Amino acid sequence: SNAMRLPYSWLREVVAVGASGWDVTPGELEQTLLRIGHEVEEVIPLGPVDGPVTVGRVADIEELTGYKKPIRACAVDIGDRQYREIICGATNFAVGDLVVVALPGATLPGGFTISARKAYGRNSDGMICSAAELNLGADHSGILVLPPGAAEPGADGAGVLGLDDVVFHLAITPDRGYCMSVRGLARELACAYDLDFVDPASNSRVPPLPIEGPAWPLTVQPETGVRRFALRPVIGIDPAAVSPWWLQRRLLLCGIRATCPAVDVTNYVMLELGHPMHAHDRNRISGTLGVRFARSGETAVTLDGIERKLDTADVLIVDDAATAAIGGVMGAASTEVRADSTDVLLEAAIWDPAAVSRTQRRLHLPSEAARRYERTVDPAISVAALDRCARLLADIAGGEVSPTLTDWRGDPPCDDWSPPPIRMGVDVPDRIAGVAYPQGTTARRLAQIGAVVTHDGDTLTVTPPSWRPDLRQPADLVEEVLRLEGLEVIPSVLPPAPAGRGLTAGQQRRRTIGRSLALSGYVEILPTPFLPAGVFDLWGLEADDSRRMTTRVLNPLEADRPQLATTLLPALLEALVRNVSRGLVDVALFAIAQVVQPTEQTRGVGLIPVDRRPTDDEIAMLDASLPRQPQHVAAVLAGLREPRGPWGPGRPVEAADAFEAVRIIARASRVDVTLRPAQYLPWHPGRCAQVFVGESSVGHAGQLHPAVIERSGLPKGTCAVELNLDAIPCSAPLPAPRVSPYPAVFQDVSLVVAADIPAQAVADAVRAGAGDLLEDIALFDVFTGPQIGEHRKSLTFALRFRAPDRTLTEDDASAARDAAVQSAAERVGAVLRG
Template identity: 35%
Template sequence: MKFSELWLRELVPTTQTREQLEATLTAIGLEVEDSDVLGQGLGNDVVVAQIRDCARHPEADRLQVCTVDAGVHGVLQIVCGAPNARSGLKAPLALVGAKIGEITIKPAKLRGVESNGMLCSAKELGIDADASGLLELPADAPVGMAIGDYLGLPDAVIELGLTPNRADCFCLSGIARDVAAATGTALVEQKIDAVPAQSTATLPITLDAGADAPRYVGRVIEGIDAKVATPLWMAERLRRSGIRPVSFLVDVTQYVMLELGQPMHAFDRDRLQGPIGVRRARAGETLKLLDGREVAVDDGFLVITDADRAVALAGVMGGFDTRVGDGTRNVFLEAAHFAPAAIIGRSRKLGMHTDASHRFERGVDPQLPRVAIERATALILEVAGGTPGPVSEVALDAELPRPQPVSLRRARLARVLGVTIADADVERILRSLGFAVNATADGWMATAPSSRFDIAIEEDLIEEVARIHGYDAIPTTLPAGGATVRAPSETRVSDWALRRQLVARGYLEAITFAFVDARQLQAWQMTADSLELANPLSAELAVMRTSLVPGLAEALARNSARQQSRVRLFELGNVFHATNDAPLHTQRIAVIACGSAADEQWGDANGKRGVDVFDLKGDLDTLAALADATLDYRAARLPWAHPGRCANVFRGDVKLGWIAELHPALCNALDLPARTCAFEVDLAPLALRDVPKSRPLSRFPSVRRDLALVVPRNIEWEALARSVRESAGEWLRELVLFDVYTGPGVGDDEKSFAMGLILQEESRTLTDQDVNALITKVIDTAASRHGAVVRG
């Protein structure tokens, strides 16, 4: 929000210096992002002058020799190269001795012709960026008057960085109210009287959008002079607010928006048929906007209609076909209230941004439309004449937002702020901000003005009191109270323990966006149950991620493209899925790796073995070991995984996730190294562990019995191992696979698993009879489940 300092001081005549005023604005939450002083150093040597005559320079085609009337300073000869220099034009003149920026004006000869001063552009005066020609002043500008006095200089353009909740400060009246409250200065209340109707000209209004558009106000003004120039004071205030003047009728609506905060629009009445209405757009409906673009809208948009023909995009921009121009004689002014939810994201969806949508998205005072119409009417009649008709208003009272009383407890205020503020000061602060305040036994009931959409709970009122009272007036004190020390849970491995384990194994932690591009999920074939955002920051961040690995893969690709041959990344974060009820978010841990299995070192003669799925399996097993868990890996086929190098990960009967080498086609499409491996598992079931229980070490020796079983080639070790563990029971302390054999002595469609079973009992030494019976049970179970036979 940009505005003129002098305009603000008209509304709140504070005696603070510019630096103090800017500090006050920042202190009350209206952060000053920039401040640009205009017309600094323009003294009495820069005056209003009028060109009496222009003649071509005898030695230069682009220069003119001008005879200039400078009032009491006499008639001067000025050589000027501005393309708009002409007889009768009034423009700023820097006299000899004047200092413009770093230049001091001196008598000079330009191509042999004397010049005693310089006619100036707006850029040369330091009040605008326009350097295309001389700054053209109105015909009634007093010749010889100091330009600073005439233009109200020096002035400052102050730019605020407003937070979205302070929609009421997107206008001068809102900013002035806050400054008046903070400085204790009396606010100059604007008196906006109703303009009586002088004709019966009206347009009927219909509202068909319910709570999205509960109020619409309009007025017909006939017989205006649309060609009249925008008054200098209005044009300068617009220009210093970052809005370039266009034409008087357009400028009036912009001025009222900056002054009061109510966006408005002016239609050419003669291009309307009536009645005027507000409704939801229809699918496939098109509309040509003021900027000349034709846009297609859907039922998510609101449109202003003329006899059911869409003529404007409600809350965003007017239509091209009903625009005002120099030929406009009769105008229809509109001001409406649109619910923020009906406007949010609509302009962004069309790739545009307007001052109106910026305000409506955050909330505009629903009581302002009639006030804005009256203010705009008075300005139009004053400058352009005309005959006003009556104000037409249609409102759905039941749908209009109404501020609700909010309780503020005296004790709660003191507890939150850590300081006691006198009751009289609390009431003064709230009333100066426009609140209706009623005292209660334990505090106050305060009702916010209709412009304050951000006041809903007690903490909002506390914030208002604190920022106006002054954060610097609240003493710095250390917090008191006992600290509660909580022991970490023994039933869950902490996130930090998992992070430390992966870091110890050579991984670096990455943090990627939870918002992703839909095309990224499509490349991974992970779009199932994806959650699209209704109001994304951009098209590249339009969907919530359903997996951590795509983001990690993108980070790995960027590192790999920057000559990092060995990259190992992990992330612990949430993924999101759409459900029939509320969106579901799940915490997961994922890793991705490429390059050599081990970092370059002198002790490894080979040192170049590429990372594979089994390296990552070892890393994942170490995470499971922190929870005293054993994981099962069951072969699977996934769209993004290399066939035959992919498995689903289970802990008991609970599926945790997957582990795989990525598919070569996917790696090629994403510019990933040829062999890239990853896993992703749900964190909660992985980190769950039983409460540790101590038990004494057995005093009896363990027994090892080796066993080689021949099984069909399609049998996986994990399946056989589960059967062995189940049949061996509680005596089995450890199961070790030490050989997998294929070749002579084993059928072509068979393989041999050689394993060691380490057995132990806590109360006695196991006998050969015990061990033989157990091994027999293991062999029988393996034979019945997997067709296993003991290798001869």
């Protein structure tokens, strides 16, 4: 089970004690409940049924034999001494049982018309119904059996089952444990409708039973967090007694299966009042009851029969013989009530909320009791819930309530359970709301929710009730006023914001890079931080490559992928094969996202108290403990870079496309870069450039190594680029160009160099020699014909000269060209082509 379920009729009945005649539509109730802060998950009407659906009594059972299943032909008394034969395949009933039959002419939900049918060689005048088939509850895998005396045969089924009802499923927030009960939800509705509320846990509704002496003996170990622990016996109950239909019906509608009166009553009163209750067979108890911590390795067997591995933070209830319960989580089988139990010891205890939560979550037992205790339970009502349970059980099952009572209230005894008072200015909710509430609203709302309120000038002294431990500061009181008045009254006013500075330079640069890559034909992906399994082995990185130093997730999505990415390429490359695998063979992807690069101090910082600002040193320590998380930009390409069309067959991706991607990013960042040959997996060592901004390395680009492509299932020819954006300085150039009105001179120069000399190094050498007259140099020819020796290449550059103050002669330009050729000779060994 999971959320707070309850039927409207019970809710209405508790509301109507103080507000006689109160009744709303389920539509209206759902709206009211949402408005004051209770999420309605489901509104589930019961039924509906039409036509002859009535109570019957099973008067005889004939077993039909020789079928794939046991089958019963049943004589059913349907009233007025009229008997019908009905074929039924269930087994969970005997002669004399009250059942619900749908005779022919009946309509069951949803839309099932019942007609007389031939079943297993016999005629059946209808069917015996299960609870699911009546839309009354989930199934017990058999048909529904009303307890003896629920109704006479022939009674109207819909009336008897109460099928007009509607069940609300609410998802109560964790700060409202008091709403895990009819008591708290009824209180809330009385607040919303300004009704008078009669508390079902008050002494006028549950008058105290006698206290003439102590019940069972009890010890409670210090520092177990138990706040209250009360015990009262009911002696001499009839074990053949079953709970009346009205009680079984309400348990069922609340999602709880009825079993026996002793257990049924504790579940009922838990639902009604919000205090979990537990029934012990007092005659299976041996000696003093004690609550203590489990020991290491201690197991206990819960009443469902599973062996629970216990831990030392877990609170037990034990006797001399065995463990009786995991405190506020689940009872043990040793004192469970049985079909022979006659003398019952009822336990109303208040456990530590955090302890119950820790324990129930480890053991995965989110029982009805445990999820109330972990949201806190009103300790003021323990004996009232005990007395309610005892009286009800003695009435249902023929007991006598014993006038003894053990009521441990801590050491020393606590007798006033109210939270401490809260001082708040009377107009504080108005200011937080932005609304001028009518005078007295705050005092009136706070009194409705149960607080005691006194006035001193503009100051209220507000003492919350014991079922509202969440009410600790003025803001908690504000929330109470605002939600009950309704958020709809709060107006909509944009704040004047001061003048901001807009996007930072880095945020602006990210937009520009992404727009430029997109325009150039790259599609963005949002890469997963979780590296592929063994990716760096697939890449073939040495054992001490910095990329291997990764931060590790303890509990990853895929156990094989615990490592956080030091590089975006593994996720981009994975996205590339996904797209290629689905028919998009020409692909160009990019990502701009942080990576995660731990270091030495990348470890833990203990809890800093949150009642104060961390000091500046504590702030800087926290930040130094985290891994470095620089922003990176990366791209991958495969297939055709340019598509085919009427103009021709299109161009395959090549390394220079990855180099051009670097230049698109650099132009977008307004920095200049240089590319230098480098060896760096996973790139092809002869088609890899390291990228520099000034003399600082910022990344790498080129074609991937053939073996990486091979081992990773990548398309042949795949290229890639990855840059560290945080290493690219934030430039802001302020050019002031002066345009020369004089004509330029054009000359070309062909230079022969060793084959391994980069062309850019020749252009740099030419520019260093040519001087200020050189306006532009552009390579337009790389030639390696037979005129050129082996391992040498001829380069021809177009040169453009221009002076700021004069027309040049050819001889002016030739002298600059000559000094450029000399500079190329001295720096890269160039020979003027001859």
